[PDB]
Specification:
The PDB classes it as transferase/dna. The protein has 351 residues and is α+β, with helices and mostly antiparallel strands. The chain has helices spanning 21-36, 40-54, 74-86, 90-96, 99-108, 115-123, 129-133, 142-149, 151-155, 160-177, 210-227, 284-292, 295-308, 332-339, and strands at 158-159, 182-186, 195-196, 199-204, 230-236, 249-258, 269-278, 311-313, 318-320, 325-327. The chain has four domains: 1-97, Orthogonal Bundle (DNA polymerase, domain 1), CATH 1.10.150.110; 98-156, DNA polymerase, domain 1 (Orthogonal Bundle); 157-281, Beta Polymerase, domain 2 (2-Layer Sandwich), CATH 3.30.460; 282-350, DNA polymerase, thumb domain (Beta Polymerase, domain 3). The two termini are 25 Å apart. Bound molecules: 2',3'-dideoxycytidine 5'-triphosphate, magnesium ion (MG) (2 copies) and sodium ion (NA). One magnesium ion is lined by residues 187, 198, 200, 275. It binds three DNA strands through helix 2, helix 3, helix 6 and helix 13.
Length: 351
DNA sequence: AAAAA
DNA sequence: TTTTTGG
DNA sequence: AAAAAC
């Protein structure tokens, strides 16, 4: 007969071939509105419903189709019913016409602007980016200044040839200071995505000392600053503790990507958002798993570990509360096995 | 908002 | 019913 | 020291 679809993204295979985009585009909009209205509960319920539909191997064409699918309560089934009716969501249409929603989308599209700043600007009466940028009283963070200066490039999204060009630059800068270092692209591109808002990398070295591990991101970014390629840089020192804003040493960057490096109407360069993460060699599988994503896959991995296995998972470790021991892993497959989960390939984590 | 405690 | 929802 | 990144 059939198998039961789990409520956990970590127990589903989600590939990029989405047969239910009509439903998930509507659910993504309704979730985003609840995120903006700080209704965390309703937001998460629409995110989970969107996630589960993305895992289906077929399109929903009737309400009978939704039987046995978890994460679809009465409210969500009303939304699906409405889309089956006319091909549109009246609920999502009303959100798209809402002035608070339109302003939040527009303002947060700027690097450096999140929910609090977007809400502040809206309550001040600002509706356009032109009126924000030209205001003489407003004060902008260094992140927002970079967000406005490179807006058109950052708003456009990175493609695979650009991501590969960035990978080459990262690898050649990293091996200059740590020749045995392992550089892995993570993030959407590792999950098989054609585009992304940024390019993320995990860096680890089997030999390097603590001090060498600490200095790598500083050495690599100076090197780029010397070449005039570092457009923005923010290095966060590690808040990870060997024995919970807890993270590995990382940096949020904007790099100048010369067009010649990508395999010229305007300047032969594009501003690219790049994130680098340095982790100790023994925690490389936990970091890789945390940074591969998707965000929904990571949420559910942690939720499943806690509620179903009485385990605690994060980007640095896996702890078993019953056995009172930290579980160690040399690969992602070993983490899945510790959790009692079937291995989900990176391209199947697009939840 | 949905599911579990 | 109240609590949880990654943390 | 809230905020923005994960
Ligand atoms: N809230 C989040 C955000 C991210 N991550 C992990 C999973 C993905 C990874 C990347 O951060 P993003 O770059 O925003 O992820 P993305 O998957 O690469 O999507 P996009 O490529 O379009 O930015 O970090 C996480 O555990 N929790
Ligand atoms: Mg990314
Ligand atoms: Mg990123
Ligand atoms: Na932003």
């Amino acid at each position: 007969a059939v198998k039961k679809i789990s409520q956990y993204a970590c127990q589903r295979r989600t590939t990029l071939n989405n047969y239910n985009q009509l439903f998930t585009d509507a659910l993504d909009i309704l979730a985003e509105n609840d995120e903006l209205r700080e209704n965390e509960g309703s937001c998460l319920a629409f995110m989970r419903a969107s996630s589960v539909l993305k895992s289906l191997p077929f399109p929903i064409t009737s309400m009978k189709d939704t039987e046995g699918i978890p994460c679809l309560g009465d409210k969500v089934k009303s939304i699906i019913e409405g889309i089956i009716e006319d091909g549109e969501s009246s609920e999502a249409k009303a959100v798209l016409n809402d002035e608070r929603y339109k302003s939040f989308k527009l303002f947060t599209s700027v690097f450096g602007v999140g929910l609090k700043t977007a809400e502040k600007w809206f309550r001040m009466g600002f509706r356009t980016l032109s009126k924000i940028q030209s205001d003489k009283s407003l004060r902008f963070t260094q992140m927002q200044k970079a967000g406005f200066l490179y807006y058109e490039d950052l708003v456009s999204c990175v493609n695979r040839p650009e991501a590969e060009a960035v990978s080459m630059l990262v690898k050649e800068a990293v091996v200059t200071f740590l020749p045995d270092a392992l550089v892995t692209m993570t993030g959407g591109f590792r999950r098989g995505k054609m585009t992304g808002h940024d390019v993320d990398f995990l860096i680890t070295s089997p030999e390097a000392t603590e001090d060498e591990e600490q200095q790598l991101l500083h050495k690599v970014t100076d090197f780029w600053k010397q070449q005039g390629l570092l457009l923005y840089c923010d290095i966060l020192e590690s808040t990870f503790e060997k024995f919970d804003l807890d993270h590995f040493q990382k940096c949020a960057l904007i790099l100048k990507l010369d067009h010649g490096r990508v395999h010229q109407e305007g300047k032969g360069w594009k501003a690219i958002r790049v994130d680098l993460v340095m982790c100790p060699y023994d925690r490389r599988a936990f970091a890789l798993l945390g940074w591969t994503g998707s965000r929904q896959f990571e949420r559910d991995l942690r939720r499943y570990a806690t509620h179903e296995r009485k385990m605690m998972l994060d980007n640095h470790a896996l702890y078993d509360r019953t056995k009172r021991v930290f579980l160690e892993a040399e690969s992602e497959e070993e983490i899945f096995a510790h959790l009692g989960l079937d291995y989900i390939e990176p391209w199947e984590r697009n939840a």
